[PDB]
Amino acid sequence: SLALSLTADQMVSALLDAEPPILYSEYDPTFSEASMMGLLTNLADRELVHMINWAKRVPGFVDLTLHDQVHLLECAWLEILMIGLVWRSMEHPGKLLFAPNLLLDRNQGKCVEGMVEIFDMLLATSSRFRMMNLQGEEFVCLKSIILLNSGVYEEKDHIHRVLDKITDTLIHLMAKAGLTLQQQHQRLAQLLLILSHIRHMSNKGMEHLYSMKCKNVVPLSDLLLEMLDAHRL
């Protein structure tokens, strides 16, 4: 298949070109719990649309059945949103850059009930990335890994061959950065163990988001509702 013939540099380049755009929120300086939740929901919904077309550009993804593509996205969507958030928040210590015009600190996260704990976990992850000096090329590899790995449950083999390819890519990026062999293995491990925390955050947030869907706090979009419904059964 195509994704397996790709070189490390090609993989990196394919992933860079596939990157979705940074979106703005429709926020205007006027901030209830419903105001902030509405902006974030509206934002996330629009991000979802771009994510789907991005997923289709991730090497090997399209080779999979429509059914498996759906399953991978249903499982990983919030993880992908979150790692996106932490990446762009890297250069803003103590703040989360949801959008260029929506930069928030933790005290503002307290505006929405139960949100600050997740807020804090995302900040600590961003801080982690900053201390590791996470590179753009490493970030695109990690995000693609999340898509393909999180729900991988014939088809699985192909998915595993691609994942190996992305691992090779990450190692290539590190060897190219001058890292020694021992340092490559260590950094790879570090980055991958962070995905465990990203999974944890998605699960915790999903829990809250469903608590809101039934509370009718804010009108979640149809697509969002279907994505949320997938984690209940």
Binding site: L66, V70, L223
Partner: peptide, 9 residues
């Protein structure tokens, strides 16, 4: 499902 539709188009 909507997701299904979006994956196609």
């Amino acid at each position: 499902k909507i997701l299904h539709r979006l994956l196609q188009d």
